[PDB]
Amino acid sequence: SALPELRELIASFVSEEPPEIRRIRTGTVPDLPGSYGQYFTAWDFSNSIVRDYAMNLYQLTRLATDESVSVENLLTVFRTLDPIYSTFLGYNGFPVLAEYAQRVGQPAESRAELLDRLTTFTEYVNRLTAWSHHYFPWDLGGERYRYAQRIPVRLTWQPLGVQVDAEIYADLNPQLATDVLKALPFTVLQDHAVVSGESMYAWAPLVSVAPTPVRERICDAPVGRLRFSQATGNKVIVQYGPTTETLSSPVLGKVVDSHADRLAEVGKAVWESTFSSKEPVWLTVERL
Amino acid sequence: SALPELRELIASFVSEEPPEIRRIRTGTVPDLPGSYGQYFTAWDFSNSIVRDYAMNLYQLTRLATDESVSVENLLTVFRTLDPIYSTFLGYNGFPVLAEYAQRVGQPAESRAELLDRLTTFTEYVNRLTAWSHHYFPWDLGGERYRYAQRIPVRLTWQPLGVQVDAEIYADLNPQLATDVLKALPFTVLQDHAVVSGESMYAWAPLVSVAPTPVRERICDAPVGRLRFSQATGNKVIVQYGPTTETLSSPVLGKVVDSHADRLAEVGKAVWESTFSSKEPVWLTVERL
Ligand SMILES: N[C@@H](Cc1c[nH]c2ccccc12)C(=O)O
Ligand SMILES: N[C@@H](Cc1c[nH]c2ccccc12)C(=O)O
Secondary structure, rough: OOOOOHHHHHHHHHOOOHHHHHHHHOOOOOOOOOOOOHHHHHHHHHHHHHHHHHHHHHHHHHHHHHHOHHHHHHHHHHHHHHHHHHHHHHHHOOOOHHHHHHOOOOOOHHHHHHHHHHHHHHHHHHHHHHHHHHHHHHHHHHHEOOOEEEEEEEEEEOOOOOOOOOOOEEEOHHHHHHHHHHHOEEEEEOOOOOOOEEEEEEEOOOOOOOEEEEOEHHHHHHOOOOHHHOOOEEEEEEEEEOOOOOOEEEEEEEEHHHHHHHHHHHHHHHHHHHHHOOOOOOEEEEEE | OOOHHHHHHHHHHHHOHHHHHHHHHHOOOOOOOOOOOOOOHHHHHHHHHHHHHHHHHHHHHHHHHOOOOHHHHHHHHHHHHHHHHHHHHHHOOOOOHHHHHHOOOOOOHHHHHHHHHHHHHHHHHHHHHHHHHHOOOHHHOOOHHHHHEEEEEEEEEEEEOOEEEEEEEEEHHHHOOOOOOOOOOOEOOEOOOOOOEEEEEEEOOOOOOOOOOOOOEEEHHHOEEEEEEEOOOOOOEEEEEEEEOEEEEEEEEEEEEEHHHHHHHHHHHHHHHHHHHHHEEEEEEEEE
16 A cells, blocks of 8 residues: 555544544634634634545545546646645644645656545545534524435444345446445445435445446435435435435445335434534445 | 626725625525525535635646646646536536636647636636635534735725735846736725634735745744735735644735834724624735
């Protein structure tokens, strides 16, 4: 692996909160970011920029697989787009992120080396984004801003104790389905969508660059739909109710019909976790 | 002009709030984004994603000036990075933004045409970011998250009624100085920094891709220092007190020493505007 220390940090942070996330959410970042004795605004920037930085990194990873763009042009693109993000994040509570971002932009021997760096770095920043999303106070605007070929797998949420059986559609997005199946089993933090609607997503431990030709409109997905979003952090997404987002999502599978009614209880508890209580909910996906 | 309607919107939004920002900050976006009867989370996503999208667009504009990357590769880079940002923004309150993002990605007959599209589109998104930053509720975490040659110009703030004299350093970053000087006079909204400390910035009506070799550490800048950040929105930055951001910022000029004592009351009043009251403070920059 190109960045072996990040690999150790990736394996560690699947179950442990990164120390930089804890410092940001408690206002203990050195040099004290934030204007006039508060740390919410810096917290707001830390959470959003690391998320959008991860989106940039994944698209740069995709570009590294595009053979029409030379390695020299790839590095030029990275060296232009990266610094404004990574230098701010290093000052705003992510020194190790900034350290490795500038390491990714070092001269590269080949396309494979650069793709290796970008794939590992993206998964690392994806995990920091995963924890930042879980702890960000999404309820802070509450009250004040209110409206008026079928591979069987098992999904378990703890400490809820809810289990559902599901099927991975291995013949729709075959490369994507194989990428998810090879990561099994894994246990990651389960969090709720904060804009979309009644859906949950969990940052899975992989970076898939597979094509996603088979998609469906998010606001048209059935209850129990398993979809996968590479662009927003390589997340396993479980739809449990009506949604709103109009973008289409790659189809991964579906919870079995005899277990789809079990998802309402999970979505409610996971919503309370992400929105208010921050009590962790752990999703385990395993091969049947 | 490649995108003449954006030029008209750019001219209008210098003094008028874009309807997109008005609907986002009042929870009147037609798609009703946000989970469980609130629109703060969608508001939080709208403000930050449009800001970081603008940062991406500027670095893509700079990439359009790099003739080591072919026009074909530039479009490939744009078509890879852009959709995940623009399609979400089109659903989360910026339909016209997503529309012209697809315009920019269309086949281009020349580098000059594509650079024209990116320069115009970047300024348009920069102004959306400007108004979004002004109206975002930065004080929401206020109580719950707290710690424990020389070209003479005049800067006027209204309706505060305070004027200062300054000098633009035309020999340090020369092309940057001419870019700003060619945009004078302009009157734009004056807002406060929300992370770095006691400085204020205003989105100026230009997109400069000039080199900025002469820089100064932000946390080391003097009182009255005029800085210019191309990468964070082509903003004229007035430092009136201590700061904490460790990055280096391009040096544009400085307020005259005899008028530097007036900046303290402007900064405090601009802080109240950005952080709490949202009463507009208008900055006018003109040559002497
Ligand atoms: N809908 C997701 C966020 C999201 C989906 N697609 C995106 C694309 C870009 C940025 C954010 C998103 C949520 O509610 O959390
Ligand atoms: N200092 C700015 C924020 C900022 C500075 N540099 C940046 C780079 C990227 C993103 C944000 C920033 C503020 O407090 O408002």
